[PDB]
Design an enzyme around this catalytic site. Structure first.
Site, PDB file in Angstrom:
ATOM      1  NE  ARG D  13      -3.346  -0.774   3.102  1.00  0.00           N
ATOM      2  CZ  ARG D  13      -4.848   0.251   3.014  1.00  0.00           C
ATOM      3  NH1 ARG D  13      -5.451  -0.947   1.143  1.00  0.00           N
ATOM      4  NH2 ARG D  13      -5.352   0.861   3.647  1.00  0.00           N
ATOM      5  CG  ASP D 142      -5.963  10.689  10.431  1.00  0.00           C
ATOM      6  OD1 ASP D 142      -6.506  11.085   9.446  1.00  0.00           O
ATOM      7  OD2 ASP D 142      -6.496   9.118  10.716  1.00  0.00           O
ATOM      8  CE1 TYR D 155      -4.677   4.983  12.769  1.00  0.00           C
ATOM      9  CE2 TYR D 155      -6.579   6.954  13.083  1.00  0.00           C
ATOM     10  CZ  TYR D 155      -5.779   6.155  12.429  1.00  0.00           C
ATOM     11  OH  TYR D 155      -4.800   6.783  11.329  1.00  0.00           O
TER      12      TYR D 155
HETATM   13  N1  LIG Z   1      -5.113   4.557   3.997  1.00  0.00           N
HETATM   14  C1  LIG Z   1      -5.583   5.900   4.600  1.00  0.00           C
HETATM   15  O1  LIG Z   1      -6.602   5.964   4.161  1.00  0.00           O
HETATM   16  C2  LIG Z   1      -5.199   6.236   6.020  1.00  0.00           C
HETATM   17  C3  LIG Z   1      -6.241   7.476   5.854  1.00  0.00           C
HETATM   18  C4  LIG Z   1      -5.315   8.300   7.237  1.00  0.00           C
HETATM   19  C5  LIG Z   1      -4.193   8.154   7.625  1.00  0.00           C
HETATM   20  N2  LIG Z   1      -2.738   7.270   6.784  1.00  0.00           N
HETATM   21  C6  LIG Z   1      -1.574   6.793   7.522  1.00  0.00           C
HETATM   22  O2  LIG Z   1      -1.070   6.761   6.763  1.00  0.00           O
HETATM   23  C7  LIG Z   1      -0.125   5.685   6.520  1.00  0.00           C
HETATM   24  C8  LIG Z   1      -0.085   4.781   5.998  1.00  0.00           C
HETATM   25  O3  LIG Z   1      -1.608   3.660   5.822  1.00  0.00           O
HETATM   26  P1  LIG Z   1      -2.084   2.169   5.232  1.00  0.00           P
HETATM   27  O4  LIG Z   1      -3.467   2.277   4.943  1.00  0.00           O
HETATM   28  O5  LIG Z   1      -1.141   1.789   4.481  1.00  0.00           O
HETATM   29  O6  LIG Z   1      -1.757   1.642   6.283  1.00  0.00           O
HETATM   30  P2  LIG Z   1      -2.048   0.191   6.528  1.00  0.00           P
HETATM   31  O7  LIG Z   1      -2.312  -0.649   5.501  1.00  0.00           O
HETATM   32  O8  LIG Z   1      -2.756  -0.318   7.427  1.00  0.00           O
HETATM   33  O9  LIG Z   1      -0.417  -0.186   7.382  1.00  0.00           O
HETATM   34  C9  LIG Z   1       0.829  -0.291   7.303  1.00  0.00           C
HETATM   35  C10 LIG Z   1       1.815  -1.614   7.719  1.00  0.00           C
HETATM   36  O10 LIG Z   1       1.857  -1.304   9.253  1.00  0.00           O
HETATM   37  C11 LIG Z   1       2.374  -2.651   9.223  1.00  0.00           C
HETATM   38  N3  LIG Z   1       1.829  -2.978  10.868  1.00  0.00           N
HETATM   39  C12 LIG Z   1       0.270  -3.021  11.682  1.00  0.00           C
HETATM   40  N4  LIG Z   1       0.842  -3.592  12.660  1.00  0.00           N
HETATM   41  C13 LIG Z   1       1.844  -3.260  12.836  1.00  0.00           C
HETATM   42  C14 LIG Z   1       2.700  -3.620  14.396  1.00  0.00           C
HETATM   43  N5  LIG Z   1       2.191  -4.239  15.331  1.00  0.00           N
HETATM   44  N6  LIG Z   1       3.636  -3.834  13.972  1.00  0.00           N
HETATM   45  C15 LIG Z   1       4.535  -3.644  12.864  1.00  0.00           C
HETATM   46  N7  LIG Z   1       3.767  -2.986  11.929  1.00  0.00           N
HETATM   47  C16 LIG Z   1       2.958  -2.758  11.666  1.00  0.00           C
HETATM   48  C17 LIG Z   1       1.329  -3.582   8.618  1.00  0.00           C
HETATM   49  O11 LIG Z   1       2.868  -4.890   8.307  1.00  0.00           O
HETATM   50  P3  LIG Z   1       2.594  -5.700   7.675  1.00  0.00           P
HETATM   51  O12 LIG Z   1       1.837  -5.731   7.215  1.00  0.00           O
HETATM   52  O13 LIG Z   1       4.024  -6.245   7.585  1.00  0.00           O
HETATM   53  O14 LIG Z   1       2.406  -6.402   9.074  1.00  0.00           O
HETATM   54  C18 LIG Z   1       1.387  -2.520   7.355  1.00  0.00           C
HETATM   55  O15 LIG Z   1       1.772  -2.835   6.330  1.00  0.00           O
HETATM   56  C19 LIG Z   1      -0.327   5.075   8.010  1.00  0.00           C
HETATM   57  O16 LIG Z   1       0.361   5.393   9.037  1.00  0.00           O
HETATM   58  C20 LIG Z   1      -2.194   5.821   8.259  1.00  0.00           C
HETATM   59  O17 LIG Z   1      -2.201   5.719   9.581  1.00  0.00           O
HETATM   60  C21 LIG Z   1      -3.259   6.449   6.211  1.00  0.00           C
END
Ligand SMILES: NC(=O)c1ccc[n+]([C@@H]2O[C@H](COP(=O)([O-])OP(=O)(O)OC[C@H]3O[C@@H](n4cnc5c(N)ncnc54)[C@H](OP(=O)(O)O)[C@@H]3O)[C@@H](O)[C@H]2O)c1
Ligand SMILES: NC(=O)c1ccc[n+]([C@@H]2O[C@H](COP(=O)([O-])OP(=O)(O)OC[C@H]3O[C@@H](n4cnc5c(N)ncnc54)[C@H](OP(=O)(O)O)[C@@H]3O)[C@@H](O)[C@H]2O)c1
Ligand SMILES: NC(=O)c1ccc[n+]([C@@H]2O[C@H](COP(=O)([O-])OP(=O)(O)OC[C@H]3O[C@@H](n4cnc5c(N)ncnc54)[C@H](OP(=O)(O)O)[C@@H]3O)[C@@H](O)[C@H]2O)c1
Ligand SMILES: NC(=O)c1ccc[n+]([C@@H]2O[C@H](COP(=O)([O-])OP(=O)(O)OC[C@H]3O[C@@H](n4cnc5c(N)ncnc54)[C@H](OP(=O)(O)O)[C@@H]3O)[C@@H](O)[C@H]2O)c1
Ligand SMILES: Nc1nc2[nH]cc(CCc3ccccc3)c2c(=O)[nH]1
Ligand SMILES: Nc1nc2[nH]cc(CCc3ccccc3)c2c(=O)[nH]1
Ligand SMILES: Nc1nc2[nH]cc(CCc3ccccc3)c2c(=O)[nH]1
Lengths: 249, 248, 248, 249
Positions: D13, D142, D155
């Site tokens: 992602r 965020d 969160y």
């Molecule tokens: N997507 C959105 O609409 C959105 C919106 C607002 C903010 N954000 C922020 O942008 C960033 C990226 O978003 P995203 O949607 O790509 O995030 P995500 O897919 O939900 O998670 C990103 C990665 O975090 C790792 N992770 C989860 N739990 C963990 C743990 N306990 N220890 C170590 N690693 C862990 C996972 O790695 P593994 O797969 O290897 O386990 C996962 O691939 C995040 O910080 C998120 O808060 C995203």
């Protein structure tokens, strides 16, 4: 001797509630109005029947113009003439209507929306301070400034400038012992031309009680800010929105 | 053909740097000015030497008055006349001086400080949107929550500009127009200011104990107008070197 | 019938002032403490002299660990066991020391600073709401966006607390529980701090050139739990005398 | 000598798209993963095929515990081991799930949500700076932090604390030439577990384009903050939300 307060746009609604509650606290009030002559005279009558010579009216247009500084100076002078002092200023008067980016001329809209919401409060702050104990100014802001209604740019710009003034005046007037604060409602008394179905739509958005603030609930926060319970508070904006500014789209 | 950009107050300093850097990226530019005619022309000459017929000048007072709406309308039209299109608007022009709460009349100070910083950008935004990667960039201020002493009207003008940035971004989004802000802390210090006062502000800056060059401000403007910022609207980027983070 | 309040870290300073003012207003009080047993007991005897069986004490460490949820559940339960109800929760207890990025192990620093400032307040809020003019008041910090040098974990703890205030206000509103914050700038300065360093902070404050009394902080808390604030939730009230508005 | 970057949660992602763009910018990358072992190894292959010896993997649980400081120390050490330098840290890894106030134990929920979103970023920043040109840190924040999702307290607390870290670290690390910034997505790549009607509900909320941000549009903002075009930017958070945070309830 009783302290004295100026409340702008005090003839009806939230401004009246602040004027009433300040009077109930023991303030002598200057009831400022623009078009609402009868409601202003009738309010002053109700307050003077409670305690004689404690309520006067003051007519002024707060639209931006080259005479506005003189109008604001006179509002403040009307308090000193009637009561011999001015302890509290409440900037409540406000024009509120859409100005889309895509009737009234734009220069008129600018003068009304920026004038009432930002420029008059600035000139009233100037005069209040220059005419000079528990002195305070309270600005009526908007808790929805960061999440503005569609096509209300000039109104939003006006309330943002009012936040700026509140912080600027708080800093500069602090050495003089004048505290400058704000109260920011979300949805309180809704517009009179707003249909009931549109009213309930906004009511359902409010987490705390699914309803609007009463004018009295707004006046309560104003009265706290002017009291000795807030003697160290300055440059603070208190939102009274029941959680509305916290709800995502 | 090449995209076109309007920059207000572009004859000197931060505006000049933005105009130069937009031109270097390939934009044709309207160099707006009020008093600095010679500098505006000399910038236009320098840019026109690089690429023929890519830089024009435009004169307008941006003070609040009855004629301001027409002046802002003609600045925008000046871009459509010279280049047949207007893609970017940079609201850079700005009056800056103190207005103690306790020389120029107060009504003139209101007209200049709220006029240049908030009302003119509002009217230019109206004209920009009406005439249509379209973006607007507003020159904000990183110290809006920690204002200069006795600078109320200026602070009010910059707060209103934040409000315009957010409102315009919301309203103009369906039209594909992005509206963003760049907030300098201390960049090029006022030409009047003394060396002593200059060095005092410099030592406050966490990052390098120096001010931002005008082109560091322009870099943030260049990013916001680019395809790298296609999803960014209603955002204000601080370019202050951490200055706003420092307590009293 | 008399309402009941839980105040954490209520043995000394700001928490004590909050405990006293709540009691003077008519609240029965749980005086939570960690190490200050003598001071907490001394306050409870003082209040019980005024009104019989209206104050009890509760010892708990609010450091983050696997037993913290149980500890926070017991603090809330002690209010119900003593008074039959819990109307007010004031999160006042706070660890405060520097944690430089470049004594305690770092994991203890994390547990103490994030535990007291954020995690315990979260767990107390869970237990408060689950057990139900109900309100929660969190003790924040007016200088959260202009933080003290090398106070990262403390600043993180206080930022997280702002997050809790906003999240809980949204989530507990259907239950009629209001969640607000009081944010002091400079109040009761540290005990061993020299008057010369104390005066440097006092001079920074625009309003009166002095720090807040613990009673002035307590006044905003008293307002937020009262009937004069029944529409107020998710709000953070600065009691800083204009300090957060002063630039570097 | 090509610069080196650590990206946490880089297997899939947004994290993956940040790692890819950094690599395309000429950076050598450490691909941190927790459980996505196959995706991380696969990504390292692709990047090493295009430019040999430029990508490694690093497995670590970023849950809060007494061993977490060591895990973070090792992630940074893993950059120095493979590449002899570490110029960029991107804090992307993040757990995201509801914690109502009224499946895992609360202690485990606290440890995962505060650990990944706040504590691990703090310890990684500490280890990063301890081992130290254009050095910078980007924290993935965020845009909806003041308008949070219902029942996401822990969160939201973690993201709030991350804003505080960004500002604190920017202030503290500035004398060392380390800039600390944030990128705040609104609606980007929507979660796998979400229904298609929920996805469209959120997409319709976005003023700019009525759609979500691609992972690459988020990576574009990260790339700008690490570049030479941002060498005066520190302590700033850039929203990449298409105006979502400006929409009222
Ligand atoms: N997507 C959105 O609409 C959105 C919106 C607002 C903010 N954000 C922020 O942008 C960033 C990226 O978003 P995203 O949607 O790509 O995030 P995500 O897919 O939900 O998670 C990103 C990665 O975090 C790792 N992770 C989860 N739990 C963990 C743990 N306990 N220890 C170590 N690693 C862990 C996972 O790695 P593994 O797969 O290897 O386990 C996962 O691939 C995040 O910080 C998120 O808060 C995203
Ligand atoms: N009501 C809400 O839901 C709400 C929400 C957010 C913020 N607020 C803020 O709280 C305050 C009170 O709200 P409200 O709804 O009671 O306000 P309002 O009824 O819309 O306006 C208050 C008064 O302003 C005066 N006024 C308007 N234009 C004027 C002008 N050009 N010159 C001089 N006076 C003028 C009017 O006085 P006359 O009738 O005598 O002409 C009017 O009665 C306002 O400042 C508002 O911005 C209200
Ligand atoms: N410089 C900084 O460190 C700093 C800090 C914070 C924010 N900013 C913001 O960044 C922007 C640029 O900064 P700057 O220092 O380069 O600004 P500046 O030199 O003070 O002003 C820029 C231009 O504005 C034009 N202008 C002034 N009054 C005008 C009027 N009444 N009508 C029409 N044009 C007028 C002038 O054009 P003419 O010469 O042709 O008359 C001037 O060249 C401003 O918006 C400022 O608020 C700058
Ligand atoms: N004072 C100020 O100028 C100021 C400025 C900004 C914000 N604030 C905020 O206002 C609140 C009160 O301020 P203050 O200066 O009065 O606070 P404080 O004296 O520094 O701390 C209050 C109490 O917290 C308790 N505490 C510390 N660590 C604990 C732990 N691990 N477990 C359980 N309890 C623990 C202590 O209780 P015991 O004595 O029983 O050990 C202490 O008496 C705090 O939340 C603070 O962050 C204060
Ligand atoms: N002056 C003034 N300023 C105002 N700001 C906000 C309002 C009413 C709140 C509102 C705004 C949009 C739809 C429904 C209800 C309002 C008002 O009624 N008068
Ligand atoms: N228009 C305009 N707006 C401005 N805002 C800020 C400045 C100068 C930089 C500065 C910022 C804060 C305190 C002292 C000096 C400045 C300027 O020189 N012109
Ligand atoms: N828990 C706790 N949290 C706190 N936050 C801030 C303070 C004291 C205010 C202060 C902070 C930094 C330098 C001088 C004075 C303080 C305190 O005394 N206790």
């Amino acid at each position: 001797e009783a302290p004295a307060a100026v409340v702008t746009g005090a003839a009806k609604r939230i401004g009246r509630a602040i004027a009433v509650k300040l009077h109930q606290t023991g303030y002598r009030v200057v009831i400022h109005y623009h078009n609402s002559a009868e409601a202003a005279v009738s309010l002053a009558d109700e307050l003077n029947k409670e305690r004689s010579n404690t309520a006067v009216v003051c007519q002024a247009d707060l639209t931006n113009s080259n005479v506005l500084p003189a109008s604001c100076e006179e509002i403040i002078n009307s308090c000193f003439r009637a009561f011999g002092r001015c302890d509290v200023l409440v900037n409540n008067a406000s024009a509120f209507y859409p100005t889309p980016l895509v009737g009234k001329t734009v220069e008129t809209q600018v003068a009304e929306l920026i004038g009432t919401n930002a420029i008059a409060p600035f000139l009233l702050t100037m005069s209040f301070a220059q005419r000079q104990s528990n002195l305070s100014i309270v600005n009526l802001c908007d808790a929805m400034v960061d999440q503005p209604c569609m096509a209300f740019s000039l109104y939003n710009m006006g309330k943002h400038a009012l936040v700026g003034l509140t912080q600027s005046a708080a800093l500069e007037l602090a050495p003089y012992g004048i505290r400058v604060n704000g109260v920011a409602p979300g949805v309180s008394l809704l517009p009179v031309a707003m249909g009931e179905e549109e009213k309930d739509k906004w009511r359902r958005k409010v987490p705390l009680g699914r309803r609007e603030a009463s004018a009295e609930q707004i006046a309560d926060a104003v009265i706290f800010l002017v009291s000795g319970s807030a003697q160290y508070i300055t440059g603070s904006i208190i939102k009274v929105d029941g959680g509305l500014s916290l709800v995502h789209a």
